[PDB]
């Protein structure tokens, strides 16, 4: 691999960034985490397929 894991690692980092970003602008930790989980699955999944 060495690229799918990196893309997966990029997605989870973006998910954490989107998690704290929503908390700063309001929202809640649980609501922000779900979007972070969603961002990790979507962006990480898209990257794992779009770029290899």
């Amino acid at each position: 691999m060495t690229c799918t894991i990196t893309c997966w690692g990029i997605g989870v980092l973006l998910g954490i960034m989107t998690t704290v970003g929503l908390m700063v602008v309001g929202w809640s930790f649980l609501q922000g985490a779900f979007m972070g989980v969603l961002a990790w699955l979507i962006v990480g999944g898209v990257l794992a397929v779009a770029v290899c």
Binding site: G26, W27, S28, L30, Q31, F34
Partner: protein, 274 residues
């Protein structure tokens, strides 16, 4: 006694501690250093249960109940008949479980096989440890552990479940329960394939791995394989043990309100129109 093939495997060595001082077999059981400690802890714990049962007034296995101390005692030791016996049996139980897992390490080291079983048992130990010491430690009292009774420890589960007003809504309980119903799903189908292939209709040849590989391919459109089912199978059951440990360690130390109230994050999201 031995088996028809056991003699060539009963070799000296493979111990973690104690060497050949304890390296022998009693009957079929392997006795190690941790088989000695297992015998001490299991027997002491079992006897103390019946000693507590004697003073409790009943020897009925259903009605035997060694309960933890009151929440007022905190994390300190309690009088042995005011909940202190439960604390000693817990120490004996933890010592027996850890010794049992470590004894399995010596057994599988002597057989030159992987340590998957002692690791998998350690998850079961962790599920027990998070129930009897970790969760009581976080909640500040030994009285939060489950009592040592066949039916008495069901009342603890029922009360702890309703301590959060509907325990099915626990998100980690949902994940953990989904793993149990699927682990039994995987066990039923995996056990069925091997039995079906090895036991065809009378008068017909037994089948190989290909026939079961193509059966669920014909059945559900995909077969995970002979090796894959054990790999996903251990993971399904380990996740069942791990997530069950999670669902109870977040109930009270991390979440004190009702579990339905947890899902309020999803209901009142900003995206949902009023």
């Amino acid at each position: 006694a031995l088996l028809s093939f056991e003699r060539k495997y009963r070799v000296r060595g493979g111990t973690l501690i104690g060497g050949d001082l304890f390296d022998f077999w009693v009957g079929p059981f392997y006795v190690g250093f941790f088989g000695v400690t297992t015998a001490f802890f299991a027997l002491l714990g079992t006897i103390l249960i019946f000693w507590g049962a004697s003073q409790q007034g009943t020897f009925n296995p259903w009605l035997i109940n060694i309960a933890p101390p009151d929440l007022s005692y905190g994390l300190g030791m309690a009088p042995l008949m005011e909940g202190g016996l439960w604390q000693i049996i817990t120490i004996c139980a933890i010592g027996a479980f850890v010794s049992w897992a470590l004894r399995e390490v010596e057994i599988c080291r002597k057989l030159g096989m992987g340590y998957h079983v002692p690791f998998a048992f350690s998850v079961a130990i962790f599920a027990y440890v998070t129930l009897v010491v970790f969760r009581p430690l976080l909640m500040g009292a030994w009285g939060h552990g489950f009592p040592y009774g066949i039916w008495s420890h069901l009342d603890w589960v029922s009360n702890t479940g309703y301590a959060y007003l509907h325990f099915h809504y626990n998100p980690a309980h949902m994940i953990a329960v989904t793993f149990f119903f699927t682990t039994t799903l995987a066990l039923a189908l995996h056990g069925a394939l091997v039995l079906s292939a090895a036991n065809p209709p009378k008068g017909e040849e037994v089948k190989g791995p290909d026939n079961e590989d193509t059966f669920f391919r014909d059945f559900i459109g995909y077969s995970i394989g002979t090796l894959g089912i054990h790999r996903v199978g251990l993971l399904l059951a380990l996740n069942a043990g791990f997530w069950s440990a999670v669902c109870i360690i977040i109930s009270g130390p991390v979440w004190t309100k009702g579990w339905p109230e947890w899902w309020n994050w999803w209901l009142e999201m900003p995206i949902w129109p009023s």
